[PDB]
Amino acid sequence: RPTVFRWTGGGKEVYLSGSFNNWSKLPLTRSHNNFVAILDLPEGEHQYKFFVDGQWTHDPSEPIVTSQLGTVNNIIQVKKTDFEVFDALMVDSQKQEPYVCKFRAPPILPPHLLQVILNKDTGISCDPALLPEPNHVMLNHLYALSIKDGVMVLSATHRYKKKYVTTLLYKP
Amino acid sequence: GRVKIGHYVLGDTLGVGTFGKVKIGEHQLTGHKVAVKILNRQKIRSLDVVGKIKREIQNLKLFRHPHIIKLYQVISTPTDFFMVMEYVSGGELFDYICKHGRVEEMEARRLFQQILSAVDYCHRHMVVHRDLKPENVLLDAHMNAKIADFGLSNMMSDGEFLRTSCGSPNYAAPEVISGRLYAGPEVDIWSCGVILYALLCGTLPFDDEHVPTLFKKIRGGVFYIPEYLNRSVATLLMHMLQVDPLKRATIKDIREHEWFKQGLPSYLFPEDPSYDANVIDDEAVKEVCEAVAYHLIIDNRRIMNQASEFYLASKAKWHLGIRSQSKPYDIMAEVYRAMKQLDFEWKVVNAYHLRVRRKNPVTGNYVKMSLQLYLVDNRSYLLDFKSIDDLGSHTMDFFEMCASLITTL
Amino acid sequence: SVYTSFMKSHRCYDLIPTSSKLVVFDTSLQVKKAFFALVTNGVRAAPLWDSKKQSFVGMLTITDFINILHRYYKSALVQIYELEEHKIETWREVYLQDSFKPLVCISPNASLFDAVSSLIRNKIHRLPVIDPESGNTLYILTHKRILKFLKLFITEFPKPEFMSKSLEELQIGTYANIAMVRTTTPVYVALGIFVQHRVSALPVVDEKGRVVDIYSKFDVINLAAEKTYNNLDVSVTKALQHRSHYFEGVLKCYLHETLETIINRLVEAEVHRLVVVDENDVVKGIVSLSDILQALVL
Ligand SMILES: CN[C@@H]1C[C@H]2O[C@@](C)([C@@H]1OC)n1c3c(c4ccccc41)[C@H]1CN[C@H](O)[C@H]1c1c-3n2c2ccccc12
Ligand SMILES: N#Cc1c(O)c2c(-c3ccc(-c4ccccc4O)cc3)csc2[nH]c1=O
Ligand SMILES: O=P(O)(O)c1ccc(-c2cc(O)on2)o1
Ligand SMILES: O=P(O)(O)c1ccc(-c2cc(O)on2)o1
């Protein structure tokens, strides 16, 4: 159905002749430099040619085809996926773990990660298991205590659904 | 005149944004006006922005707010993408600030309340604008604020930071201009702070002709506070325009401020009383199973949200990952050899970023985490551990994978 | 009748806090380190993770610390070797050699009625919420959390006839064979009654014949906190001396007092039990959270 025919080049009088009509000249409206015409077209292949300032010309950015005589005419692709937004973006998107090792400095550590949920003081007028609402950016990150008598203490805040769980593991 | 797209006649150009050109669309039958954003298919694929445009459409299609430009439909053609959206006759907020002398505290507050309400809606939907300025904020016939141009916007992920420098230098946060990693919401607050100053003062708090001199002003965070501005609004601007993102104000902090509270409507924010009766909370997705069922969920959620003390809170010191004073090349060489002993498979993303994986011998499931080396103050480095979402226990499997790595190192 | 329908509709997920702290211990970890970790983190219980089996085996509570002290304590002069050297796995080995225990847990998607049933039926006070998809423990569910959650929805649902009825008429709680301790009773003797009678708290009575304080299972972790666990010969008053300064008097309820008044008193004071009293000062029994929750289920 809706197909766009835009002329990027300069000119005063621009006409469009294709396969949709019997190679007849159609007047094109201009904005500032661009000459455009939106027409309803069915699925398949359509041949077209431009007529600028009394001379026949073709768009270089679009695919072209040459006949036996020597006439250069553009080619337009009319697909079923081209009209559906999610399908059209999928078409445009189209166009393993090695165990081996591989002079700018690494990125500067953001201050958000320094805000430890466990180090923060909580009010005495509440349950000790309760914690403040954590930042989305500190989630999944590993926080640990200094090793004392062959035992490592590891902690990480994880999201279940809308609730956050701060787990602690005392592993020797 | 002759050019038509979905019963709409395309007129004069309204302006050009980040991606594509925006033009006026008048109805052939009625005369109804809509804004049409034209995205060229070739322009999108040549810039590798196919994923960015996909997220832009997906968000705006589900986005419902009276202070964000509503996207009616999107028309796809074999050469271009036509985004049909809500048209606002009033134009830019920047033009309103330029036409008038200074926007009075009575009207400037109302506009800022509408801007922050729309900004908060984005953040709650895990979307950060990154390009907030009075040029991007639009106005209508009824004098209401409207947010547009989601070209530089990005999705917020759990445990993931953003680096991409987005927006105008005058409105950009100190962390944005420096080119360092940020969480997201703190950048929008800085941008909102500049808009609030622009509405009341009529000028920019950080403005200079020379580019590095302008960048020095943002990093310093020193700005003039005029005598006509009251002490209440002065403290709000100082808290919003903080160099430190940790010391910087949040939406919850602005909402609790005495100046912002003045004449604040009860339908703008979700915690307010009129929100539950005037705004749809999208609970229909959860209440899709098997008329009175919708009101039961809203009432139950309100009782749970009111009791803040029941769900939220009012010795050795903890630290993120492991610290090392040695060279970055030596730390990276130490991590690769430590993984070979434990039989681990790793995908290389960057010289310091590694996507690591192992197989559990008891459960059988694959355990995966992400490693990243960061820079502390000077000559000190930090190795970060982050669990990947996609019989045993997922959190326990992550802790055990870290424990074996720290011991081998 | 009314509260039974409420618990059957509401899931366990609704009770879990927005941001909560969870402590997990490995079976290979020394038992002494585990009780010291409960104090520092301020938690009363913690699930146990078996590294070799790759699954949660059980729960480590204060009852385990009480069971170690009474079984291994000899004197104040000789140190408790077992508490100092035993691991969680080694302590559980002798504890499960008499009778093993399959993990009692609830799913977050499961109804609140099944969770209350699981606590009373198995005679446990702490139930860990484990997600069947990920296998992670999310929150430790208690009788206190359920009653406080039900208190939030008392106005939303119509109050039945039993809520306006007296405790005497309803007859809820233990009224016969109440295990009590004297003011001069040593800690070791008190710990023995916790193992034999399988009770959670013991009311302290003086030489005059009046309830001065209440020695619960939670008061035992203070011996690990102050490192006074090695001397269990000391009196119950000396053991409760740490919290005696803030203390006014042990919470009480009357037989003529309505069920609604009793439920409101427990949630506000944040206590686990109330002492039943007749006229001016006559003890009749003990009413707890477990007794009240059972009445709303049966
Ligand atoms: C630098 N700012 C400009 C102002 C201008 O064009 C832009 C490119 C910028 O806005 C971000 N544009 C506007 C909108 C738009 C949406 C997405 C991206 C960029 C956008 C719309 C949406 N509906 C509005 O009516 C309409 C509006 C637009 N602009 C206008 C000028 C006059 C009257 C209305 C317009
Ligand atoms: N550059 C920009 C741009 C367009 O203007 C168009 C147009 C377009 C051009 C001109 C006009 C127009 C024609 C006559 C009078 C007024 C107009 O706005 C309408 C639409 C169609 S596809 C497209 N893609 C683009 O990337
Ligand atoms: O049966 P348990 O779940 O092992 C247990 C341990 C401690 C308590 C307790 C503490 C307290 O003040 O009341 N009950 O109950
Ligand atoms: O079976 P009970 O001894 O009557 C009882 C009721 C409530 C509790 C309790 C214990 C605890 O740690 O939290 N709640 O124990």
Numbering used by the authors:
A (entry chain B): 78 to 172, 188 to 194, 200 to 269
B (entry chain A): 9 to 298, 321 to 344, 399 to 474, 532 to 550
C (entry chain E): 27 to 324
Paper passage:
AMP-activated protein kinase (AMPK) is a metabolic stress-sensing kinase responsible for regulating metabolism in response to energy supply and demand. Adenine nucleotides (ATP, ADP and AMP) bind interchangeably to the γ subunit where three of the four cystathionine β-synthase (CBS) tandem-repeat sequences provide nucleotide-binding sites1. The α-regulatory subunit-interacting motif 2 (αRIM2)6 is required for sensing the adenine nucleotide bound state of the γ-subunit and transducing this signal to the α-catalytic domain, resulting in either stimulation (AMP) or inhibition (ATP) of AMPK activity.
To gain further insight into the mechanism of C2-mediated AMPK activation we solved the X-ray crystal structure of full-length α2β1γ1 isoform co-crystallized with C2 and AMP to 2.99 Å resolution. The phosphate groups of both C2 molecules overlap the phosphate binding sites of AMP in sites 1 and 4, while the 5-(5-hydroxyl-isoxazol-3-yl)-furan moieties occupy novel binding sites independent from the AMP-binding sites. One heterotrimer contained AMP bound at each of CBS sites 3 and 4 (white) whereas the other heterotrimer was devoid of AMP and fortuitously contained two molecules of C2 instead. In both sites the C2 molecule makes six protein-mediated hydrogen bond contacts, while C2 in γ-pSite-4 makes an additional π-stacking interaction with γ-His298. This shift reflects the formation of a canonical kinase salt bridge, formed between conserved residues α-Lys45 and α-Glu64, in the C2-bound heterotrimer.
